[PDB]
Ligand binder design. Structure first.
Ligand SMILES: [K+]
Ligand SMILES: [Mg+2]
Ligand SMILES: [Mg+2]
Ligand SMILES: [Mg+2]
Ligand SMILES: [Mg+2]
Ligand SMILES: [Mg+2]
Ligand SMILES: [Mg+2]
Ligand SMILES: [Mg+2]
Ligand SMILES: [Mg+2]
Ligand SMILES: [Mg+2]
Ligand SMILES: [Mg+2]
Ligand SMILES: [Mg+2]
Ligand SMILES: [Mg+2]
Ligand SMILES: [Mg+2]
Ligand SMILES: [Mg+2]
Ligand SMILES: [Mg+2]
Ligand SMILES: [Mg+2]
Ligand SMILES: [Mg+2]
Ligand SMILES: [Mg+2]
Ligand SMILES: [Mg+2]
Ligand SMILES: [Mg+2]
Ligand SMILES: [Mg+2]
Ligand SMILES: [Mg+2]
Ligand SMILES: [Mg+2]
Ligand SMILES: [Mg+2]
Ligand SMILES: [Mg+2]
Ligand SMILES: [Mg+2]
Ligand SMILES: [Mg+2]
Ligand SMILES: [Mg+2]
Ligand SMILES: [Mg+2]
Ligand SMILES: [Mg+2]
Ligand SMILES: [Mg+2]
Ligand SMILES: [Mg+2]
Ligand SMILES: [Mg+2]
Ligand SMILES: [Mg+2]
Ligand SMILES: [Mg+2]
Ligand SMILES: [Mg+2]
Ligand SMILES: [Mg+2]
Ligand SMILES: [Mg+2]
Ligand SMILES: [Mg+2]
Ligand SMILES: [Mg+2]
Ligand SMILES: [Mg+2]
Ligand SMILES: [Mg+2]
Ligand SMILES: [Mg+2]
Ligand SMILES: [Mg+2]
Ligand SMILES: [Mg+2]
Ligand SMILES: [Mg+2]
Ligand SMILES: [Mg+2]
Ligand SMILES: [Mg+2]
Ligand SMILES: [Mg+2]
Ligand SMILES: [Mg+2]
Ligand SMILES: [Mg+2]
Ligand SMILES: [Mg+2]
Ligand SMILES: [Mg+2]
Ligand SMILES: [Mg+2]
Ligand SMILES: [Mg+2]
Ligand SMILES: [Mg+2]
Ligand SMILES: [Mg+2]
Ligand SMILES: [Mg+2]
Ligand SMILES: [Mg+2]
Ligand SMILES: [Mg+2]
Ligand SMILES: [Mg+2]
Ligand SMILES: [Mg+2]
Ligand SMILES: [Mg+2]
Ligand SMILES: [Mg+2]
Ligand SMILES: [Mg+2]
Ligand SMILES: [Mg+2]
Ligand SMILES: [Mg+2]
Ligand SMILES: [Mg+2]
Ligand SMILES: [Mg+2]
Ligand SMILES: [Mg+2]
Ligand SMILES: [Mg+2]
Ligand SMILES: [Mg+2]
Lengths: 50, 149, 126, 119, 207
RNA sequence: UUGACCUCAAAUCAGGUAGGAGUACCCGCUGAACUUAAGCAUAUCAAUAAGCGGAGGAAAAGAAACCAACCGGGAUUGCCUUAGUAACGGCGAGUGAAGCGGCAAAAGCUCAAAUUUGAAAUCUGGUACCUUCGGUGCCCGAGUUGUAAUUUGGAGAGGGCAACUUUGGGGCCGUUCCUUGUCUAUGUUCCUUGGAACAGGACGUCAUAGAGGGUGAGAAUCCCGUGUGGCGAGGAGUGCGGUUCUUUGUAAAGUGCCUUCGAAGAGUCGAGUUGUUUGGGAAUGCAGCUCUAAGUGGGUGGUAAAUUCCAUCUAAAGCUAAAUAUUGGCGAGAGACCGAUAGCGAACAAGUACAGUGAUGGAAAGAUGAAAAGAACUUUGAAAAGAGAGUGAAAAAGUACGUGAAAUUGUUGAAAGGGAAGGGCAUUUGAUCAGA
RNA sequence: GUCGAAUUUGGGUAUAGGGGCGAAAGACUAAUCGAACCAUCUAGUAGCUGGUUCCUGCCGAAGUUUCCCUCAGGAUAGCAG
RNA sequence: CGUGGAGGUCAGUGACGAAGCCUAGACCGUAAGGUCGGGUCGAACGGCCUCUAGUGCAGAUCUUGGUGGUAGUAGCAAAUAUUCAAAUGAGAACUUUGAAGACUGAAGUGGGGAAAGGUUCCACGUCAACAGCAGUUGGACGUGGGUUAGUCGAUCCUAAGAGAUGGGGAAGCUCCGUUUCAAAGGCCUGAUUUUAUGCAGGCCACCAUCGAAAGGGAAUCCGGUUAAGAUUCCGGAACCUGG
RNA sequence: CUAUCUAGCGAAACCACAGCCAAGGGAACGGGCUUGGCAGAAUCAGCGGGGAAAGAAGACCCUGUUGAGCUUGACUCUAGU
RNA sequence: AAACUUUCAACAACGGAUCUCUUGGUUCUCGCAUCGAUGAAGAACGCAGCGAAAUGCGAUACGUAAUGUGAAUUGCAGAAUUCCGUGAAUCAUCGAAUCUUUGAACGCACAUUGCGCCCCUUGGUAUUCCAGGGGGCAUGCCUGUUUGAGCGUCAUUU
């Protein structure tokens, strides 16, 4: 809203920090079932619902 | 739903009976556990026969008064006539029942006799003595069977 | 032929225990037999593999090859022996993963703890 | 390879405080360096050294307070034993072994006797 | 599981929506939404007539009928043709029943117990085991039933003075107290004619 | 004016305690309807779901105001029975116990009501010290509107007479149990196949070990284990087995005879009525309201009542292990169970992603290969890629990865084809093929 | 149509399901209203509709009787194995 | 007849190839089916005697998944409108620059905000997917940068209202009520300064708290500055509150 | 401006199998069956005769010992008073 | 005659059936009894050289201490190889600690990272203002302590 509560801003900060692709050195680990970031969020696709 | 010539049935399954169905899958496991508990209790208790001496007693209800069976405990009169006090009999392994009364001299005499037999056939260890290992027997009932007069 | 109620013959449980064994358990799991000479010299049959042990490969395509252990890759359930490698097409070299049950220890890397282990297992003259 | 707690335990609280300050200065310098240098892992050792020094300092302080409260009832609650809440609320061994005078008399007079059937 | 297939709030959409009237998962946004539920024909549904633990598992048999079957099995052990027909490679073997010395009851070591069985002629049956061992066909192999093999001789004794432990590692060989003879061992697979090696004490105690 | 007392307050007073979670099982409250009755209202579902309060490792119950009617049993609980029975019920649909008997486990008890009255003998706390789950001294305080000892109905108490019998708790070393550590057998011998031998064949070895798992394919004998024993470690605990310093105490307890007594629970029992409930039927329990006891009394004795007896217990106060329960928790062992549309919703970063304002709803998704050896290098292309080369046992395994069906599709080949196609009988022709 | 007052509208606040709210249409109460949504009871019941999975061999019907709150159902006798 | 699993047996088959799958190739059976060859493939499986069942599909507007014909079809037609050249690029109707032609026409297609969103802002790299044509461009993708306050808001006040306490109700979850049937108090200081406090002179109360980023309200402006911040930074010049 | 043709892009409804008629009989209005008429690849734009075209387990009507909203000295109750 | 259509085969597609796998589920049995104001369960936000998650943890942050084992961890980087050692490890064990903001949740509030009061202390002359650090302040109830209230009430001076 541009006048947001600190709680909201903290949640947005966490969302920004976790808005990234999978680290590439994962997928090199020994067993590594993980293929991609399946929890990736985008502002144009799925809203955080606060 | 009354079809051809069959007996009228009274199957009581109109409640949520499937919520209370006890299948005794643990019959064998419980038998094993009971035997284990009897063995552990025998080892834990003194070389004492795992059960108290019970009196002979007449069953009520003429359907069963023709037979005799083990009762709960010897009456106070029976213990006194056998020469013990109730507290000491309870400590030396005699079941004592204050509720039961003696109105039958034959049953009273049989109970006094088996109390005397038990006193003659048991060895009470001293409180602070040696009492060399006396080869625990496990069943006072088997040692002193109830005999039908 | 198991007799104790504390051991499980369940294949699912055994496989889970193997594949999720921690590093310390994997050390025991990755044991190698001693060679004939070492068995005679030490009085013991097998020992957990160690990074500086010398081994001889007795099974597989690398059979007959010898070297010193390079790493006990406990995560991979395998050991890597120096000079037992695969030369890739690009010129690089990668270690060959070997299982210690397919090797014989021809020279133990010894220290106080290893000597104590040998004596505890019933070894003579260390 | 960092500090060792058994080595720190031989030092006075002033020496430990000074070493803690030095380790914090070293960590600050290391994280200044981290911005330029790619992937230096030496920060972890200093962080664990700071943790070890703090642990030993707290061990010394808590032991001092334990000595101060030795013997007397009403020690501090974080120095009291942490069993479960129910276990802390349970009767002590003294209680729940308390018996009345009548009960003690009769249990001394007629204890469970040791006996065997011998036939 | 008694709740399998019913952990949903699915309701029938009813008619008029051009789909079958099966109950359907509500909500939206997941793919499970609108899917059929609760039906034995539905993926993720409840099976028809879910199996219950109170199915009858054990079967009561009259004690006398059980003893009749056991006596018949014991008698069949003495018929050479039945023993041959039941596997049990007794071809070059002396008179059946095969009774051996009571010294067999006191053997402590597998080596000497096996040597005694070979001497009295059970070598071919022992070798029939250890050669019939094969991976079980089907899913039973990962239900702790991985391997199958033939049955060897049943050694019957009167007093266990080591023979049971001495023989318990020999594949296919079973041991039995003559006082308690098992039908499941005397007629494995309901097939009469188990190869039975009686000790002398067990043979005398049979009467 | 001072000092009490009683009652009531305050303090961030000294020290504690409750709440919330879990909730499978357990103790209560509250409480349906779908349903069955072929309709339906009593009934049934059901004294159930949902809702609320409260525990534990079990809970609850529990040592008779019991059952009985016998030649009497003798706390409670649970199992097998009683029994689908007595009884209830639009006597319709339906429902439905209990006594006895066999068994599992067994265990018994304590307050109130008593003058210690020649001695509040009792207890919390504070403080000092100590051998600290506590002890001792001192000090306040609580308490006579009653804290100890003594008694609990089986009794028992007060006096009188006579002896006899028995005994308290700590030390140390083992045992009991708990949690753990470590050690303890026998082939990597030869040939064949294979990328790999763990396959087949030969010769052996151990077996109280041929359970199970791993390792490049079906491994007793390669590895871990398994089997059998050995050697330790840290605890809990007095349950017992020995040894020692403690010796309690002219203390406590039990027993015989005579004698005087013998306190035993009230708005409770019981009664009426109302509601609910029960198999309980002129009323089984529970609860509201009104009435409201007695003491050779009171309760019960399954048909209401008056009268006379009899039997059996002793309410209105209390504690208590085991046998019993356990879709929760922790630790284990298993299965004629399921084998990735199955089995839990979830074999996987699943109660995840995602939907909904919200309560809530809630997926899909496992498999290269023994090993990445995950394709160096060349060449065409802007590139993705292709074509080679190469790795590999296999690329008819290339991470769009085991196998790789069908629908549906491309190419190739064969054939036929005037408003469907497909089918049956028969033979021609073409193709193809077994038998002898 | 109305457009300066029974005007339009933001935000805050109140009213919650046999309840609200209604200048009243059974209207509105989150695309849901002659009783919202969510979960559970619940796999509610259905004399009614649909379906009901291998082969061959032998035998082989009934739609009629009586009774029923029965008339799309059942019991009963008959027919059949 | 066939299927999953179980006891027995054939010391059955099998990495020299089990199972599965494909096969207008062969054989047996009336049939359910069974058997063989060839291809593919890679780790198990079968005959017989019995046991057992979650055991046989064409349908259920069946369930889940997958796939067609329709069909390169319907269509991608509202909001006046595009054009020339160059640059970039493998590639330009659509990117960038220039030129031209137009439009919104200040109740904007302009410049800011509130709710909401949450990084979309800005730069660099960059086009597999997305932008129902395209794409070298982008609100995309990858990596980073960025939001500076005594004065602007919140914070404080009370509004409709919400809501503890004291009490009362309710089996209870909780309900009522908001100053009520309550012993509901801190702040002044004589004196005290054995200590500005307790004893002790004396003054005021019919009451928690929440409730507004549009109501009330202490105080800041100009110029400049960034890729992206500005009444916040920088320069200068003020003002308010508390002390 | 579409439709139309082209480049790029690219769905859906629906679909037992399909698609020429006349008459006959037939569940009494056939695309199929019978008897005749006939009948030649592959197609494009239109079109609204037919496919008893699609859309929806007819909402009218009846049946059900299926409801619900509503009403009333229906039956049986009930808050309140 | 092609094209087209249809059928079949081969190869290639599409798709993911089948088969074989299985650290998962399901059911049975056995044993055990241990959440929380000493702050639980749950939540939020953080923490690694390079992590978005899962898992772990709490500013001592994929962890500290202690004990055991006895040389790893491993995707890379880095470190070490004295590793015959109070010593590797994403090891096991676990008794000492830390344990942000919360949450029954406790100074008051909470759509605020809002607002107090007390004590000790440090700095700014500073008991009063501002700031930093440390420690505190919920409610019901119990026992006790202290200070009190009431002609409820006793005695006493009177
Ligand atoms: K209605
Ligand atoms: Mg299922
Ligand atoms: Mg199979
Ligand atoms: Mg206090
Ligand atoms: Mg609670
Ligand atoms: Mg039902
Ligand atoms: Mg009905
Ligand atoms: Mg009906
Ligand atoms: Mg009805
Ligand atoms: Mg309930
Ligand atoms: Mg508990
Ligand atoms: Mg128990
Ligand atoms: Mg209890
Ligand atoms: Mg009594
Ligand atoms: Mg009884
Ligand atoms: Mg009967
Ligand atoms: Mg009932
Ligand atoms: Mg006495
Ligand atoms: Mg071994
Ligand atoms: Mg294997
Ligand atoms: Mg009484
Ligand atoms: Mg009730
Ligand atoms: Mg009582
Ligand atoms: Mg009780
Ligand atoms: Mg699944
Ligand atoms: Mg599959
Ligand atoms: Mg909604
Ligand atoms: Mg797959
Ligand atoms: Mg292959
Ligand atoms: Mg494939
Ligand atoms: Mg096909
Ligand atoms: Mg109307
Ligand atoms: Mg059904
Ligand atoms: Mg016929
Ligand atoms: Mg019909
Ligand atoms: Mg099955
Ligand atoms: Mg094959
Ligand atoms: Mg075919
Ligand atoms: Mg394979
Ligand atoms: Mg089925
Ligand atoms: Mg089908
Ligand atoms: Mg069909
Ligand atoms: Mg369909
Ligand atoms: Mg479909
Ligand atoms: Mg078009
Ligand atoms: Mg259009
Ligand atoms: Mg336009
Ligand atoms: Mg331009
Ligand atoms: Mg205009
Ligand atoms: Mg204009
Ligand atoms: Mg931008
Ligand atoms: Mg496009
Ligand atoms: Mg494109
Ligand atoms: Mg480019
Ligand atoms: Mg971006
Ligand atoms: Mg302002
Ligand atoms: Mg309120
Ligand atoms: Mg406010
Ligand atoms: Mg304002
Ligand atoms: Mg700006
Ligand atoms: Mg300035
Ligand atoms: Mg016609
Ligand atoms: Mg006609
Ligand atoms: Mg037609
Ligand atoms: Mg014709
Ligand atoms: Mg034509
Ligand atoms: Mg038209
Ligand atoms: Mg038409
Ligand atoms: Mg219809
Ligand atoms: Mg309809
Ligand atoms: Mg009818
Ligand atoms: Mg109705
Ligand atoms: Mg905490």
């Amino acid at each position: 809203a541009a006048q947001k509560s600190f709680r909201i801003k903290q949640k947005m900060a966490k969302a920004k920090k976790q808005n990234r692709p999978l680290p590439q050195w994962i997928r090199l680990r020994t067993n590594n079932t993980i293929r991609y970031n399946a929890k990736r969020r985008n502002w144009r696709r799925t809203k955080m619902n606060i | 739903a009354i079809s051809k010539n069959l007996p009228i049935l009274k199957n009581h399954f109109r409640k949520h009976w499937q919520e209370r169905v006890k299948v005794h899958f643990d019959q064998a496991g419980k038998k094993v556990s009971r035997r284990n508990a009897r063995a552990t209790r025998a080892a834990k208790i003194a070389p004492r026969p795992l059960d108290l001496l019970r009196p002979v007693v007449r069953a009520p209800t003429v359907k069963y008064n023709r037979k005799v069976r083990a009762g709960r405990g010897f009456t106070l009169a029976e213990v006194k006539a056998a020469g013990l006090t109730a507290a000491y009999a309870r400590t030396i392994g005699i079941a004592v029942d204050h509720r039961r009364q003696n109105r039958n001299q034959e049953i009273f005499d049989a109970n006094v006799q088996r109390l005397k037999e038990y006193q003659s056939k048991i060895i009470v260890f001293p409180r602070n003595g040696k009492a060399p290992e006396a080869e625990q027997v496990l069943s006072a009932a088997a040692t002193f069977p109830i005999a039908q007069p | 032929a198991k007799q104790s109620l504390d051991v499980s013959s369940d294949r699912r449980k055994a496989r889970k225990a193997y594949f999720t064994a921690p590093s310390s358990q994997r050390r025991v799991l990755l044991s190698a037999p001693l060679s004939k000479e070492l068995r005679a010299q030490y009085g013991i049959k097998a020992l957990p593999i160690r990074r500086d042990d010398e081994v001889l490969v007795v099974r597989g395509s690398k059979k007959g090859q010898e070297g010193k252990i390079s790493s006990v890759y406990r995560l991979k359930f395998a050991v890597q022996v120096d000079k037992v490698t695969k030369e890739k097409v690009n010129g690089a070299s990668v270690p060959i993963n070997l299982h210690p049950s397919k090797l014989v220890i021809t020279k133990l890397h010894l220290d106080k703890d290893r000597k104590a282990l040998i004596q505890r297992k019933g070894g003579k003259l260390e | 390879a960092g500090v060792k707690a058994y080595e720190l335990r031989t030092k006075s609280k002033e020496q430990l405080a000074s070493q803690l300050v030095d380790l914090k200065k070293e960590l600050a310098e290391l994280k200044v360096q981290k911005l330029s240098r790619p992937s230096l892992p030496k920060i972890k050792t200093v962080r664990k050294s700071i943790a070890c020094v703090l642990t030993v300092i707290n061990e010394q302080q808590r032991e001092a307070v334990r000595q101060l409260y030795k013997g007397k009832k009403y020690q501090p609650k974080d120095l009291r034993a942490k069993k479960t809440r129910a276990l802390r609320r349970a009767l002590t061994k003294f209680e729940a072994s308390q018996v009345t005078e009548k009960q003690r008399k009769k249990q001394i007079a007629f204890p469970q006797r040791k006996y065997a059937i011998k036939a | 599981s008694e709740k399998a297939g019913h952990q949903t709030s699915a309701e029938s959409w009813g008619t008029g929506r051009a789909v079958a009237r099966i109950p359907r998962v509500g909500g939206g946004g997941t793919g499970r939404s609108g899917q059929g539920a609760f039906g034995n024909m539905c993926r993720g549904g409840r099976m028809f007539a879910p199996t219950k633990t109170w199915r009858k598992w054990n079967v009561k048999v009259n004690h006398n009928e059980k003893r009749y079957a056991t006596a018949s099995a014991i008698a069949a052990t003495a018929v050479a043709s039945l023993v041959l027909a039941r596997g049990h490679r007794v071809e070059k073997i002396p008179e059946i029943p095969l009774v051996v010395s009571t010294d067999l009851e006191s053997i402590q070591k597998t080596k000497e117990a096996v040597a005694a069985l070979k001497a009295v002629g059970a070598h071919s049956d022992l070798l029939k085991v250890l050669k019939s061992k094969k991976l079980r066909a089907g899913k039973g192999k990962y239900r702790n039933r991985r391997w199958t093999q033939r049955r060897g001789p049943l050694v019957v004794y009167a007093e266990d003075n080591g023979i049971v432990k001495a023989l318990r590692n020999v594949p296919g060989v079973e041991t039995a107290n003559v006082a308690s003879l098992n039908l499941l061992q005397l007629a494995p697979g309901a097939h009469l004619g188990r190869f039975v090696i009686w000790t002398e004490a067990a043979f005398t105690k049979l009467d």
